[PDB]
Every structure is written in structure tokens, then in C-alpha cells.
Amino acid sequence: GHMNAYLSDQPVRLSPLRDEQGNQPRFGLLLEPGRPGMHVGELPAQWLKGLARSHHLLLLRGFAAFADAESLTRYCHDFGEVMLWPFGAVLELVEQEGAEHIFANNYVPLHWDGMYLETVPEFQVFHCVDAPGDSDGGRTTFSSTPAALQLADSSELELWRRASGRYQRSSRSAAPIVERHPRREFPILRFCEPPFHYDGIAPEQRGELLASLRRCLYHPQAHYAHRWRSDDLVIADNLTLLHGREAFAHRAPRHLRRVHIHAEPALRNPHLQR
Template identity: 50%
Template sequence: MTTSDLCGHRLTPMEPFGIRLDAAMPGTPVGDLPVDRLRELAREHHLLLLRGFRGFDGAGELAEYSARWGELGMWPYGAVLELVEHDDPEDHIFDHRYVPLHWDSMYREQVAEFQVFHCVDAPGAQDGGRTTFTQTEAVLRQADPAHRRLWEQVTGRYRRAVTDYSGECVSPVVTTHPDGFPVIRYNEPVPPGEEFINHPELEFTGVGEERLPEFHRTLQAALHDPRHQYAHAWRTGDVVVADNYTLLHGREAFASRSPRHLQRVHVLGTPPMENTALVR
């Protein structure tokens, strides 16, 4: 593993992908870092972790900082989603259970390029709650050719009817990144026996019903392969920028009532990427 530096702060590659920037002096404001260089790192490495820096005093400050990365994706609740367990959750994002791999903005007019996460309060080391990220370009590059040919034949149709997240989209499982290389767009089915609130309706076509079990089995094995998946254990103050064009992400279950509080902002690309998968 090699290290370098950015403005005197230490850059270290992560495994199996991503890059971490550690503050040379704990408490250095995140806003002091050059966003243009951070954006380059996020695009090159697909995941950027800023650790040891001073975070944000409230959602407004996070939104103001994120706007330096590009145009914000706005929701009925505003720019900042508060990801914290609710007493009586109406959707899985406010629950403590497992969340399968998916991509963000699948039901929106425009697809976010970046997710900016800020950890307000991290769960305990034994409480779970890691966020999982899978680098789908690498999955395809290293896939068994027969498996990849199967995946390339399949199209997914996804429907949700939940406040703020309702919609329908249809996307080939293997599609194209705006820069021209292949990536995977897939909303993973919930494993048998897992409880899940408001899972979308899923339909996969393009191959016969008899081949769908093989499709899901081989694709999920590749997506969860340690060569392609990184699971982030949160620390309070962490800022993570994820490439939503390339990665899929999910969440491991965490101990209910543990202090897990993340904030998330969507940043659109330049120009914004229109969601051609959306059924209007």
C-alpha cells in the first residue's frame, strides 16, 4: 500500500477500491480542502473517505458544502436526508434492518452523480450498520464470460409506491456509464427470511424463467465478492463521497436503538444525467 498527500493530508488507497484522506491535524475543516481535486479523486477511485476532519454543524452547512461539488438533487424534504432509525418506520431507510444493493435516483428525473454522506453519530463497533459499496465496472471486467453474457440479456423493471420514492424504472442490468464504459444497474431482491419494509416490485425479463435463478445467483455472488465490495464501518465525523454512476450500495443490519445517524445529499453531474430508465 502506498501513500501520498493532498495539502499536507495523507492519502491512502483502500481495498478493494476507494481512497482515504486522513487529516494531518484532527479537526481541520472539510471546507478547507480543494473540491476540484476531491472531485477528481472521487471519479478516479469511485469512493472517497475524508476522516479526522471537522464535519458540519447541521444540515444547512452540509448542503452549502455539497453545493460546491455541483447542483444539488432536491427532494420534497430538501437537499439533506436524515438517515436515522424511526420508532415506527414507514420505509426501510428509516429501519435498522438489511438493505439490498441498489442505485440511487432510480425513480427520479435526473440521476445523481455523487452521494455525499456525513456521519453525525456512528454506531458502536459491535452494532453493525456498515454501508456496502460494490464497484460494478470491476465486476464486469473480471466476470466469467458466460455469466456476463447472461447478465447482458436481462432487463429489470422496478416499481415503488412510497411517499417521496414512488415511481417505476426499466433498465438493462448491464448498461453504459456516461463516460462510455459498462456498469451494472440492479436492485437486488431481498434474501428469503429477511424482513423488509416497502420493497419494490421486481420483474426481470430477457431470458426464460428457468434461467433467472442462475442469473440472480451468479450476479449476486459477483456483486458481494470481496474483490469488488467494500463495507464501510462508520466513525462519527466521517464524510464519504460515492460515485453513484458506477457503484451499487446497500446497508448491513444494525442493532436497533444504536446511535447510527447519517446525512445524505445527492449531487448531480455536469451536465445533469437524465434518467432514461424512468417510466413517465
């Protein structure tokens, strides 16, 4: 059980985001339609963008949504400045039941989008085209870095503040662990989690940096695992959150589509090694 504190002037029902077990982290907002048959496009994108910036993760659930990738794309061009890839606006993310090429990892550690790019998108917009039946594990995960910062104790925090991450894949990227939001100034974390060099601390302290970061980022106050449903529309603040993916035993059938939206104006990657 929990209480609901939101009353909107928009034709929607708002409530705190909670995962399927009822845990309520310190971010996220659930939006549901205020009229029969309401489509996501009926809400003003400028308003949604405001909510995404303060709540960091929006889940629009139960709305009629986009008939195809083209419709989603046109919507996103109205929503903001789409960050285009060689493939266009929409990344297709399709998984088949029990599929699995044996060289992958069983999961995706926490990171942010655009780490190795010339420009960093402010938002991820995910449309769940289809999510039939239920899966075991495999949920998309999100962590609020400001929440993690509130969980850290004095010594954990002191360690984080002197640490820097160096990442390579060739593209290279480096960021202090503790950052400022690149437009809005508030404290955030930028961390790419190992399944990777960490400077500014002693090598003997690497183990403790990772443990403490993980304790706080995966804490129930800071972490949310999303179980997709058909026609969910999720808008994530990529400048504040880190995201990843929960381990799975039985991969379920699922179709997601992702579009990136530029910051205003477009954000030059401050961490890319040029």
C-alpha cells in the first residue's frame, strides 16, 4: 500500500511509480489515460518533457499508442529534436521466446547512452510494440543517480568524489564519477559499471568504489526494474539516470522501439576523448 499525492490539470491519472513487487523508489511517475481510448499524442510534449526532467522516468501505461515506427518517428519529431542515427530515428529491439551465439553477457550493467558519441541525448523514448506473456528476469533497469548520492555515507561519498572512470571500446571516454548535471547543475553520477579503469584513488580502493556504487545504485530507493507491457511508452532522463538490464533465465518474446531526443540545445559530449 501507498498514498497518491498527484492531481494534474491534464486529463490523466498520475501516481508514484512502483515496481511489480510494490517497491517505490525515489523517482519515476506513472501516467494513465483520463479518457476512454486516449492516445499518448493527446498530451502536450512540452508538459511531458517537464515531468521527465523532474521525475526522471515516466511510464505512460494503458494509452493507445503508435501503429508503426513511422508514426512514432513523426511524433518524436514534434516532441523535440530527434537524434538521428544512420538507421534513422527508431532502433528496433526485438527478442524471441527462448532465443540466445554464445559469447554475450547474461545482463547489461548500469551505464548511460551516448558515452562514446559526439553528442549525448537528453531522453530515451521507448515504445513497447508488443510484450505477450510474462518473462522471468530480463527487465529493463533504471537507477536515479541523485537517489544513490543520498544513500552514500561520509566515507563512500569522499571516495566517489576523487574517482574518475576511463572507458574504452577505438572510442574512449572519461568522466568523473561525481558530476554536475550538464544543463541544470545538480549533482549526478556518471558511471559505467563493469560486468574499465578507475583513477584518482588507490588501486586497493577499486574494490570498495565498485561495491559502494553498486550498493547505492541498486538500492530499492534508487533502482527500478521495468516489466514491459504492450503499448507502454517510457520516457527516461538519460542525463540523470543510468540504465541497464536484469539477468534472464528464459528470454520472453518482446518488441521495443527506441528514439533518442537531443538536449536543448544539442549536448556536446563532455567526456569523449578527442
